[model samples]
Target chain A: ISKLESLLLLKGEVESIKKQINRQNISISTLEGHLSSIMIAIPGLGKDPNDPTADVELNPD
Target chain B: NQKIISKLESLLLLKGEVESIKKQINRQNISISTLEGHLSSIMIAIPGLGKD
Candidate 1:
């Protein structure tokens, strides 16, 4: 009986993790779409490809 | 024992599914990070932007 209870709890854990994965999938999808637009706008113009931290930005002004 | 076995069988299956979920999440995170890096690089290359 206790083992069954444990199993039921594990079932819940699995469900929770599955939900997180689905959420992340959507996040990745949205970011991918945005990246596509930025990539096309500037084909090959990264200051330092080796280091992404040294980035550039558009003129927001 | 039989009842316990049955529950464990189902639980194990679910655990495997969770493993797959973890793997997929890892892959997706990698892709997102790479793409974000590219976007950052391009944004940095814009005009009137200089950091010396």
Candidate 2:
């Protein structure tokens, strides 16, 4: 009986964590878009053109 | 009794999965902070862009 209760509680926790992960993914996507736009505007800051999420080196010259 | 033990094992496995996903979330949070830092640096370097 107690084991079933624990399982139910854990299930709820897992659901909540999934929601948090979804929200974080959205934030990451938005930030990536902003970063890509800035890099495109600047001369030296270039990211992988194919993958916007890839790490970019900044060269403010 | 046997059925209860089986359920307990399943619970253990579920808990492990939860821990793994929690680690993934932590990594995502770090990535978000890194991206934000890059954006801030660019804004500081540029002339016309206002505060974020």
Candidate 3:
């Protein structure tokens, strides 16, 4: 969860979570001429096998 | 052919055991990732459940 999406301690949170995921620098796409929400793509971001132990924080960037 | 069939059956049995464990793994690729599996899960889940 990013600093923004982690604020989603409310009922209407899914949309905010989706937005946060969008800004995650990974590609996302939606199909045209199809059921919109029924299909969306999150780029297959290769998982970091070390994320469990990695320190990931924004350094005032 | 009969000897080959017997060997295959034994091999298939071992493979099926591995597949059964895979189903319980919750599809996180832990068969190669982490070694301390359920101990950690149970420790986190149960210990933090107001167990004191």
Top-lDDT candidate index: 2
When 1 and 3 are scored with TM-score, the better candidate is: 1
* Model 2 CA lDDT for position A2: 83
DockQ of each: 0.18, 0.33, 0.01
List model 3 lDDT by residue over A1-61, tens digit each: 5324423333244464455455332222221212232223222234543224446668736
TM-score of 1: 0.42
Of the true interface contacts, each candidate retains a share of 0.17, 0.44, 0.00
**Highest-TM-score candidate:** 2
- What is the Cα-based lDDT of residue B15 in candidate 3? 51
Model 1, stretches more than 4 Å misplaced? Answer: A44-61, B1-42, B46-52
The chain A TM-scores for the candidates, taken one by one, are 0.62, 0.66, 0.24
Interface RMSD, in order shown = 2.8, 1.8, 18.6
CA-lDDT, candidates in order: 0.66, 0.72, 0.39
Q: What are the per-residue Cα lDDT tens digits for candidate 1 across B1-52? A: 5777876688668777867767787777768677766665543445675554
CAPRI quality of model 1 = incorrect
Each prediction's TM-score versus the true structure: 0.42, 0.54, 0.20
iRMSD value for model 2: 1.8
Q: Rank the candidates by lDDT, best first.
A: 2, 1, 3
What lDDT tens digits, residue by residue, belong to model 2 across residues A1-61? 7867786768677676777778787877878777666656664554455445555668635
What C-alpha RMSD separates each model from the true structure?
11.4, 10.6, 24.2
